[PDB]
């Protein structure tokens, strides 16, 4: 019937919706910093916008290694054991600090990068100051991600959105204290926003720890009672699970960087519309990612409960819901490609060219939604390895050469950005096609074999 499926589709949304608010208010910090740093110059607004382009991928690579804790914790809760739950958390933190060792190194190498980009000193001396101010937050951002990954793994999502929203609401007024040199605080024109970001991240971490200690819903775990110690044998287990998830993100970012370099030979009016279209296609990526995150915790719960039909129905309903939301937002983007391009910019040639790229951005949305929901469902099964192979093959072997063939080389008149966007679409379709096949192969296996694989 349909009274058995719908219940699941009521759970999933109830899990997926809060995460979205906790993920929208994460780019709000960068946006607010950039906007408030432009009310004092256009040198500052372009100095804290370069420094937010080296910070974000560097911290995403670090976060990617702590996203393998969600299935590990959610499966123990389903199996009903729960008394191994405090042991894994105390390991995750020991990992988080360690993965802040390389990042803080690479950020100190910021200078050698900007002089590689042909940047004048008048804003280099501001970008370096901003980066040195924000390095004090990667110890308190990765730990907060580990704690949030725990609370999500416990099928409890509320304490993330509230804390993120409070963080942003405390970021807005506390920039104006340190930017406009007020209340006996440094003038600090373009680095005050970095200092405000560090302070608000530390406050959010402290509030989350206070909630974890006091909450009456987690009291049956007794989390902060032991003083456990690291052990390499068990800790290498988490690294093997977590590495491919980070590798896929790294290769995706490098692909998006290389495409811009190949488009640079064209006019500076072409690259601006490409950047606008890509930025907007990255903003509306949050809905399928949130649905994937909800499916990931839901699928690992059923397999912990020694139930497999529950995992199958969870994955299928996740796919259907991701497809439906992709379709609705693609229609709402195609119907409204007038006002947003005018929100972004002012030149009418730039808007007249970006209206053409939004058409392909709609198909891009509709395809990557299915791709990412399938990837989340596969991550539910602790199969973190096949994702990397399949997405790397579908990105850098089919996605990239086909863009160049339809673009520069003038085979098959030359096409500009549109050839590259068609290359993106081909890569995404191939990735979705192979991940679906892998999921079906893994879903048509015996109960013992599938559980054993999910047990490891």
């Amino acid at each position, epitope marked *: 019937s349909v009274h058995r499926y719908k219940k699941e589709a009521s759970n999933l949304i109830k899990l997926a919706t809060p995460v979205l608010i906790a993920s929208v208010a994460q780019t709000g910090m960068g946006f607010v910093d950039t906007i408030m740093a432009g009310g004092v110059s256009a040198i500052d607004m372009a100095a804290v916008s370069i420094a937010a382009s080296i910070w974000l991928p560097s911290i995403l690579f670090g976060v990617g290694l702590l996203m393998a804790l969600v299935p590990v914790v959610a499966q123990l809760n389903g199996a009903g054991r729960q008394h191994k739950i405090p042991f894994e958390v105390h390991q995750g933190l020991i990992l988080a600090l360690l993965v802040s060792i390389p990042i803080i190194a690479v950020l100190f190498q910021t200078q050698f990068i900007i002089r590689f980009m042909d940047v004048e000193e008048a804003m280099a001396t501001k970008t370096v100051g901003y980066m040195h101010a924000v390095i004090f937050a990667v110890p308190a951002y990765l730990l907060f991600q580990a704690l949030r990954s725990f609370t999500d793994g416990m099928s409890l999502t509320k304490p993330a959105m509230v804390i993120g929203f409070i963080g942003l609401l405390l970021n807005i007024p506390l920039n104006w204290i340190f930017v406009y040199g007020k209340f006996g605080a440094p003038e600090l024109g373009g680095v005050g926003c970095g200092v405000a970001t560090a302070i608000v991240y530390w406050i959010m971490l402290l509030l989350l720890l206070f909630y974890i200690v006091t909450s009456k819903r987690l009291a049956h775990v007794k989390v902060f009672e032991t003083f456990h110690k690291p052990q390499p044998k068990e800790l290498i287990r988490l690294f093997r699970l977590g590495f491919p998830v980070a590798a896929a993100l790294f290769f995706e970012v490098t692909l998006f960087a290389v495409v811009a370099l190949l488009v640079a030979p064209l006019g500076s009016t072409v690259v601006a519309a490409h*950047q606008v279209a890509l930025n907007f296609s990255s903003l509306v990526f949050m809905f399928p990612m949130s649905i994937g995150a909800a499916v990931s915790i839901r699928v690992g719960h059923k397999l912990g409960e020694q139930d497999t039909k529950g995992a199958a129905i969870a994955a299928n309903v996740g796919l259907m819901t991701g497809l439906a939301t992709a379709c609705i937002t693609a229609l709402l983007t195609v119907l409204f490609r007038e006002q947003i391009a005018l929100l972004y910019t002012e030149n009418q040639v730039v808007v007249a060219l970006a209206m053409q790229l939004l058409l392909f951005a709609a198909i891009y949305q509709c395809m990557d939604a299915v791709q990412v929901v399938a990837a989340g469902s596969l991550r539910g099964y602790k199969d973190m390895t096949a994702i990397f192979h399949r997405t790397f093959i579908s990105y850098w072997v089919l996605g990239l050469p086909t863009g160049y063939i339809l673009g520069m080389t003038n085979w098959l008149q030359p096409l500009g950005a549109k050839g590259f966007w068609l290359g993106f679409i081909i890569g995404l379709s191939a990735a979705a096609l192979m991940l679906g096949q892998r999921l079906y192969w893994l879903q048509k296996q015996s109960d013992d074999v599938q559980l054993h694989l999910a047990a490891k």
Partner: nanobody
Amino acid sequence: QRQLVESGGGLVQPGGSLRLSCAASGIIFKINDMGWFRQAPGKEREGVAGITSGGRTNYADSVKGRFIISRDNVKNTVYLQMNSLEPEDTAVYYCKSDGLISYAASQLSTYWGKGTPVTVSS
């Protein structure tokens, strides 16, 4: 040329005053720096004032006390009030604007003007 246009320059006796105005189109102007430049024959282009998106005017050394740069945001224009002119202020004055092209970019874009001549003599 098309983004920036200047107007208001003409002949004026020594000890007189002018008012140049630069009107910008196709530019956000809320997040842009501004500035005026001059170039006299035989010499080279050199800065003469500058305002940065919130104030903090940046006059030149041989210019302070006579030139007062201001900006107006409701109708996007930049002014420059010339006072106590002298025979050495004769040149063609340019307008310049730099800032982000859109809210999604990271590098600055610079646009020039065609210039308006000013000639001071008896």
